[PDB]
Design a binder for this molecule. Structure first.
Ligand SMILES: O=C1c2ccccc2-c2n[nH]c3cccc1c23
Length: 286
């Protein structure tokens, strides 16, 4: 289609702000479609060494074609700015709901965990590691299905070299894997560690390694220093114990543990119909 331009849209509210990008709601005049348009100022990204992250985001998003990921529809630029036209996920961050409700019941924990697992199966199947999986990066569309975002710190592993490990130091302290801290590399299984932290957070209300500053969190991660509250659903506790494993080759779902089949077969997921989750009606949070 014809390359789009800023004057093709009516821009509305800011949806999200980052250190070097802003996401604005926009309506395309010719179609009345709403998009979340991520806008980056060229001068700022150029001066602040952020171009590689922008190019990474574009390259990774261009490869994805799955209901549980934000879609990149179009890109364009003008003299000052770069624009990425993205899916609009009207209900915003999963984190908002955790904070408001406190924690999720078992049905809701299972459904949303299953969507995230299905998403990771797809991503890992394409040889891509997210590296910054967390509730702030898991958006909810109008129908309350997930849409994972934030691919500027993702990595396409090279199929040509059978690459398994990546060397860039990226992530968020609460969710970062022990291997990144200790061995200075991440792998697909690093996202499974983040998953285990997320499941824990949905049930407990807080992620498992927490402190008022990053170094203290790191110290806890490397020692596997965390505990479960009372009434933590037993099969979810079992699952989290199978994900929060220091040895990245021993996490349920990882390649050395024979992949997603055994993870999807975990007793916590007994009821789950995996093949068409995005067409199922999500359970109500309240
Ligand atoms: O931060 C948001 C965001 C925040 C609130 C509501 C919707 C969105 C939203 N919809 N699509 C995208 C793509 C990237 C980021 C964001 C979105």
């Amino acid at each position: 289609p014809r390359k789009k331009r800023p004057e093709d849209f009516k821009f509305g509210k800011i949806l999200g702000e980052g250190s070097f990008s802003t996401v604005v709601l926009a309506r395309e005049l010719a179609t009345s479609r709403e998009y979340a348009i991520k806008i980056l100022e060229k001068r700022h990204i150029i001066k602040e060494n952020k171009v590689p992250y922008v190019t990474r985001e574009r390259d990774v998003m261009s490869r994805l074609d799955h209901p549980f990921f934000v879609k990149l529809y179009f890109t364009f630029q003008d003299d000052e700015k770069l624009y990425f036209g993205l899916s609009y996920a009207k209900n915003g961050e999963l984190l908002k709901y955790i904070r408001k409700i406190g924690s999720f019941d078992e049905t809701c924990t299972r459904f949303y965990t299953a969507e995230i697992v299905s998403a990771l199966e797809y991503l890992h199947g394409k040889g891509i590691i997210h590296r910054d999986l967390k509730p702030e990066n898991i958006l909810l569309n109008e129908d309350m299905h997930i849409q994972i975002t934030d691919f500027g710190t993702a990595k396409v592993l090279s199929p040509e070299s059978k690459q398994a490990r990546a060397n860039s130091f990226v992530g968020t302290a609460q969710y970062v894997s022990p291997e990144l801290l200790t061995e200075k590399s991440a792998c697909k299984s690093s996202d499974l560690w983040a998953l285990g932290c997320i499941i824990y957070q949905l049930v407990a209300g807080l992620p498992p390694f927490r402190a008022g500053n990053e170094g203290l969190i790191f110290a806890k991660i490397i020692k596997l220093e965390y505990d479960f509250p009372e009434k933590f659903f037993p099969k979810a506790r079992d699952l989290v114990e199978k994900l929060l494993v220091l040895d990245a080759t021993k996490r349920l779902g990882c390649e050395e543990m024979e992949g997603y089949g055994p993870l999807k077969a975990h007793p916590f997921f007994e009821s789950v119909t995996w093949e068409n989750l995005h067409q199922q009606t999500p359970p109500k949070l309240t």
